[PDB]
Amino acid sequence: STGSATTTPIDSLDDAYITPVQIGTPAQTLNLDFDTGSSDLWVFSSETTASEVDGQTIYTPSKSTTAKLLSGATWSISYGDGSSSSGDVYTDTVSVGGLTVTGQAVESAKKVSSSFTEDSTIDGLLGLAFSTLNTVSPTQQKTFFDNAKASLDSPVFTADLGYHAPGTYNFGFIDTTAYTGSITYTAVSTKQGFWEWTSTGYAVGSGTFKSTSIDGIADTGTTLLYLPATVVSAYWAQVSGAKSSSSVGGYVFPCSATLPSFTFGVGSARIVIPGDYIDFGPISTGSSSCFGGIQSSAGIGINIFGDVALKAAFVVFNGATTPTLGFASK
């Protein structure tokens, strides 16, 4: 089997992407944030504290003839940005772009943090990291991909995120029309539960390539590109007036600037992030100070190839017995 679904930016900055997901019978369609940096599929629901729902579409398990309470199971997750959610668990039928999994764990939120409430466009998350990170207790549950894998034509999914435009998540096949040149594959460590890999270096603008190993994760659920302070300083030094602002929480730059591109290495191959992808707009409405899309990972504890990086590429998440990651230009 295969599946193919369009993923759409939630706002004009590409802060996140939503993908429609069918849950239950009859289908309840919710727009979920596909997150290769976590492993829980959780939704706003009829069980979510009412004051914490503000415009989201909810899953109502009592209206699904295929929903079953997973007795005794609870979940609770905290994300790198400080947001969180928790609740109980149902199993139900879940379909993405024509690909159906029966008996998928659907984690129903009883509580969500303010960041989730305040984002009306995201109805939940669909985790695509390794199932070892799944938070369901006392019986850990599998991701949608893990459940689908054996049925797929090939044990892969691909992320093709757009810049200020829709893109595509495919399951079970590689669309050879969706990228240019070849896909370069690179090793993955699953030891921390992530799609963790090592970039071979970087360049800033038209500058020379610096060969250096940068361990990090391919994370569709993180907006920005978080890299070591040395790398980030080298980038922003090429932007007149750019500075790190403790009050704002990262590098800012004059909105009048033209940003240079940023290149990262995948083996001997190179992915070029255009300068415009690095612009996250005014720090507050009407400001002429703009927020940068490349930020320091210092004190995160890990480098994160988030959407800023991934959307410059066609990305293969290869879930073969030994997982790998592939990157192509597009």
Side-chain angles (χ1 to χ4, degrees), residues 1-62 64-67 69-109 112-141 143-148 150-190 192-242 244-330:
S1 59
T2 63
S4 180
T6 299
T7 193
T8 301
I10 64 165
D11 63 23
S12 65
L13 298 179
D14 299 346
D15 282 318
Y17 297 77
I18 50 171
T19 309
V21 176
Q22 282 71 49
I23 310 176
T25 310
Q28 299 180 40
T29 299
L30 275 63
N31 295 329
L32 304 188
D33 184 351
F34 281 25
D35 181 14
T36 63
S38 70
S39 306
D40 289 49
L41 192 176
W42 75 260
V43 297
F44 278 79
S45 78
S46 56
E47 303 178 325
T48 310
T49 300
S51 61
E52 298 180 349
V53 185
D54 188 6
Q56 295 80 10
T57 295
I58 63 168
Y59 170 58
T60 302
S62 67
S64 175
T65 58
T66 41
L69 180 70
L70 185 63
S71 181
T74 59
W75 63 279
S76 182
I77 192 161
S78 305
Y79 296 101
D81 68 352
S83 68
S84 63
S85 53
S86 60
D88 53 20
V89 188
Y90 292 80
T91 55
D92 210 339
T93 303
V94 171
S95 299
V96 176
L99 170 65
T100 301
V101 167
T102 59
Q104 174 65 45
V106 177
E107 302 173 33
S108 167
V112 303
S113 61
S114 57
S115 181
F116 287 113
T117 298
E118 292 162 359
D119 187 357
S120 69
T121 71
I122 292 176
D123 301 325
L125 268 64
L126 189 151
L128 292 167
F130 293 87
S131 293
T132 53
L133 294 179
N134 176 266
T135 77
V136 176
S137 178
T139 307
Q140 189 171 64
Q141 301 294 304
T143 70
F144 175 81
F145 179 55
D146 206 339
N147 282 324
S151 299
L152 295 177
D153 290 357
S154 178
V156 307
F157 68 90
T158 65
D160 181 7
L161 301 179
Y163 168 66
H164 294 175
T168 306
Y169 282 101
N170 289 330
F171 292 81
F173 73 106
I174 288 161
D175 179 356
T176 61
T177 72
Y179 58 86
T180 61
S182 59
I183 307 178
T184 295
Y185 289 85
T186 196
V188 165
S189 172
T190 63
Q192 293 191 84
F194 300 122
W195 292 92
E196 188 171 2
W197 65 290
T198 302
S199 172
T200 48
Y202 69 98
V204 175
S206 62
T208 62
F209 188 83
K210 175 70 170 183
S211 292
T212 184
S213 294
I214 304 297
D215 294 340
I217 65 168
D219 185 1
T220 58
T222 291
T223 314
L224 307 185
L225 174 52
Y226 293 90
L227 292 172
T230 46
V231 178
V232 175
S233 182
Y235 177 81
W236 289 109
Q238 298 304 309
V239 180
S240 188
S244 184
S245 168
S246 54
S247 61
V248 175
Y251 282 88
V252 297
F253 68 94
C255 296
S256 60
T258 302
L259 296 177
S261 63
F262 185 89
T263 299
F264 63 92
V266 182
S268 58
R270 304 291 179 253
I271 299 293
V272 180
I273 305 171
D276 296 341
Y277 289 27
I278 298 161
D279 177 16
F280 279 75
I283 60 171
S284 290
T285 304
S287 180
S288 70
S289 183
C290 274
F291 198 67
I294 295 177
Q295 295 295 344
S296 179
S297 65
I300 292 178
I302 197 160
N303 300 304
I304 308 173
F305 294 87
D307 296 335
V308 163
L310 302 183
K311 76 186 171 195
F314 177 87
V315 188
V316 181
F317 294 79
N318 172 25
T321 304
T322 300
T324 65
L325 272 171
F327 294 81
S329 295
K330 68 187 184 189

